[PDB]
Every structure is written in C-alpha cells, then in structure tokens.
Amino acid sequence: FQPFSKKQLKVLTWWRKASPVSDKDGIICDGSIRAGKTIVMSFSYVMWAMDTFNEQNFGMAGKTIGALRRNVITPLKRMLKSRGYRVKDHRADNYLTITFKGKTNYFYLFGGKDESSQDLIQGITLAGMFFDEVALMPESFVNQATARCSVDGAKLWFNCNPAGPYHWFKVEYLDKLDEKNLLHLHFTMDDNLSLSKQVKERYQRMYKGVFYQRYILGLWVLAEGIIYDMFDQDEHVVPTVPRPYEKYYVSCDYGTQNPTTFGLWGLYNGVWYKVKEYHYDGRKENKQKTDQEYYEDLMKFIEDIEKHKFKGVIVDPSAASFIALLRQKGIKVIKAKNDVLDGIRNVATALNKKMILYNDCCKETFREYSSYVWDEKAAERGEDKPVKQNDHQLDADRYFVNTILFG
Ligand SMILES: [Cl-]
Ligand SMILES: [Cl-]
C-alpha cells in the first residue's frame, strides 16, 4: 500500500479548518534523511495553496533551481497528476501553472545560493513560500522571500536536514517557534513506514560521527575536529599490487602556487581503488609548473593503461585553461561540481561502506586524512567548512567520489 505515518498525515492536514493548529503561520519539518517528509511537505503545500486561494502566486525555493527540480518538482509533478491535478511547466520562465477543480494558481521557482539571491525575489507578490533544504540557504534570501509573502492568509513552509546548532535557521526559527507562531515536526526514519527494520539499519551503517548524528538521528550537532574520523588504516588501505581493473579515471586538484595532484582510480569487483597519487608542490620544490608541464606529467601518469579503459580526467573547475589544453589534446574532461559539504559527506559514506580503498603508496593522501579538520570558529558562527590546508589530495578524491560514485 505504502501508507502514511501519523507524522506524515499531520503535514498533510495541519492547515485544514478541522485541525487545532490551522492558525499557525507555517510549518518546519527537519530531521533525518529518507523519512518521507519532503514529498508530503511539497504535496501538502500545493494542496493547501489550491484549496485556499485562486489566481495567486506561490514561491518554491531550493539551494539551486536545478536541485529543487530534481529533489521536489519532478516527483511532485508525477504525484500531483495522479490525484487529479494538472500541471504546466514554463521551463525557462521558472514557474508552474497548476489546475484543480476549476481553480488555478501559479508556482514560482527560486534558488537561494548566495548573498545576491535576495535580489531575484524583490518584485513578485506571494500567497506562500516553500523552502527545501533551507539550512543550505543564506539568511538574507529567506528574510526577503518571507517579506514578499504579503497576501493575507499566507503561510511559510520549511523542509531541511540539520546543520550545526549555531546555524541561523536553528537560532532564528527553531529556537523561536512560539515567537514566529510556527508548527515543528521532527522526522526520523521511523516515520517512513515503507522502510523495514533491515533497510533502516543498512542506512544507519552508511554514516558515522557528526554525519550520523545529523542525517540519521536528526540532531543539529556542531562540526568539530577531524573531518574524516571514520578513515582507518586497518580497513581502508590495501597493498600496492596489480589488479585486473575494468575501468579508470584520473581526478585532479590544480595548483600553481599550491600543490597539484592526480589520483588514478580503478574499478575492480565493485570497489574503486586509488591506485596511485601524484603530488607536485611548487613551493617546496622552488619551481612552478605550467599547464603544459602538468599535461606532460599526466600523460606519464597514465602511460601504462589501455586507452579503451580510461574514461577521462575529473578536474577542479577553476582550472579552465588546463581543461582547454586537455580537450585540445583529445583527453576527455569532466568538470567537478565542487559542492563541498555534500562531497565531504559522500566521501565519508564511501569510506563507511568501503566503496573506495587506497593502495598503500598513497602516503600523502593518508597524511592529509590525519590533519583535515573543521573550521572551529566558523562552526561556532553557524558556518560548516573545512580549514583549507593540506587538502590537495583530499579535494581530488572528493571530486572523484562526488562525480562518479554519487551525482
Ligand atoms: Cl525526505
Ligand atoms: Cl537542509
């Protein structure tokens, strides 16, 4: 059947006249991943909007519009259409026209990426606003978007996973629930009735440490100390011996004034192996290399592998000139998105499931693993980010894991 839990049904009904909490100005759902909160939240938003207004404008925001469409709008579309709603997607325009029982409203899509994101939601007048991944958004974009919700009866809807305790959304919204007159429902995987006791426990084994506390337990816990505290040389390091690899990639972090790194990654029996590393530090050497010199080193680095098994070079986005040279030379290139927090989370998960393993010649990588830490002072201000020192192999690994194994 795939039935809804008690907590999911509250998301669907809170706003109705029969509900005790219908006068609340909005809702916040936070907590764990895979909790079946995102799709009910979005469905309930459209349902509430279509039932309460006609010919109004409504907002929907993600970290980017692309992500919003992937995470919410596409599954929301399919689900809306199956229960008698109709949808038109004005692609470039970035809004939807939704129709139900002779009523029509307009749903505008936004991205809340940076301090300029606030400038794109100044004109429009709104009867509601929905934020997916609000803990990934700037406070300024959310202050504006909420200020554009001027129509009488307007409600605010927030969906997120936890960040740190000092994060603005925890401090200004979740700790001020009665002040803002919002409802709050906290989800864990127990609220998702379609997951067995086995599958829930499998998801539990994908996370340890801070990311386990946030994405499984749903706790707003501070990031502190070693980032990859699940990395373990008893489990993640293997001998440097030949294996019959079926597929290869190279991942690259670029530096002229910082080190440049290559990692050769090789697939064997379901696991991607870091076969070796290249580590050129121009500062230590007292000699900087050019794009051409690094191209030459990269050709040496991949000499002894069959060209039909090499699937390309994953490159740090800022190395645009280097990418042009590689394409000019016939080398396939994939630009890494460089989504930092999601990449770090995904590297951690790759280690926990042993999706990756390292040859013991990757000695520079291992030195970075032992030193790569969270920015302590930033975390205590609400900003989760690494201290960007001795992370040149680790950034390349992240590009590889995040581009090929996730995404
Ligand atoms: Cl969800
Ligand atoms: Cl979030």
Say whether 73 counts as a known binding-site residue: no
Whether residues 148 and 7 share a domain: the answer is: yes
Domain boundary among 178, 206, 222: 222
Whether residues 192 and 311 share a domain: the answer is: no
Declared resolution, Å: 2.2
Residue 4: strand, helix, or coil: coil
What is the Cα Rg of the chain in Å? 24
- 41 CA to centre of ligand 1 in angstroms: 9
Cβ atoms of 94 and 57 closer than 8 Å: no
Residue 35 CA: which ligand is closest?
A: 1
Whether residues 71 and 143 share a domain: the answer is: yes
- 135 CA to centre of ligand 2 in angstroms: 4
Interatomic CA distance for residues 80 and 94, integer angstroms: 18
Residue range(s) defining the domain that contains residue 288: 223-407
- 36 CA to centre of ligand 1 in angstroms: 4
- 379 CA to centre of ligand 2 in angstroms: 16
Whether residues 9 and 156 share a domain: the answer is: yes
Domain boundary among 195, 222, 249: 222
Whether residues 202 and 285 share a domain: the answer is: no
Experimental method: X-ray
- 67 CA to centre of ligand 1 in angstroms: 14
Residue 137 CA: which ligand is closest?
A: 2
Whether residues 282 and 156 share a domain: the answer is: no
Tokens of 110: 């936004």
Whether residues 329 and 183 share a domain: the answer is: no
User: How many domains, the chain?
Assistant: 2
Say whether 38 counts as a known binding-site residue: yes
Whether residues 218 and 287 share a domain: the answer is: no
Interatomic CA distance for residues 382 and 393, integer angstroms: 27
Question: How far is residue 212 CA from its own chain's centroid?
Answer: 15
Across-strand partners of 186? 30
105, with CB counted inside 10 A (0-12, 13-18, 19+), is buried
- 169 CA to centre of ligand 2 in angstroms: 10
Interatomic CA distance for residues 378 and 283, integer angstroms: 28
Domain boundary among 182, 199, 222: 222
Distances (CA, A) of 356 to 8, 212, 301, 313: 36, 19, 20, 18
Among residues 359, 299, 301, 354, the alpha carbon closest in space to that of 326 is found at 299
Say whether 104 counts as a known binding-site residue: no
- 1 CA to centre of ligand 1 in angstroms: 18
Whether residues 155 and 228 share a domain: the answer is: no
The answer for 312, left when phi > 0, alpha when psi is -120 to 50, beta otherwise, is: left
Whether residues 125 and 239 share a domain: the answer is: no
Tokens of 377: 């002072």
